[PDB]
């Protein structure tokens, strides 16, 4: 899993908004810099900027 290093507010409807410290499951990471992620903290799913998160434990 990954952790958010910054907050991120969605900029299109299918983005995922998240908070620093949130734990994320990366669901698709083959389409470019934006990854499809599922928040294990909120249960929501959407696209995220890959440079805002880092591998966690």
């Amino acid at each position: 899993t990954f952790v958010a290093l910054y907050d991120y507010e969605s900029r299109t409807e299918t983005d995922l908004s998240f908070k620093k410290g949130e734990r994320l499951q990366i669901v698709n990471n083959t389409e470019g810099d934006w990854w499809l992620a599922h928040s294990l903290t909120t249960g929501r799913t959407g696209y995220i900027p890959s440079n805002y998160v880092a591998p966690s434990d």
């Binding site: 389409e31 470019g32 934006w34 900027p49 440079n51």
Partner: peptide, 12 residues
């Protein structure tokens, strides 16, 4: 915060 990357290539 980091610069946001350009959006991915849209798929057709």
């Amino acid at each position: 915060a980091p610069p946001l990357p350009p959006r991915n290539r849209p798929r057709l």
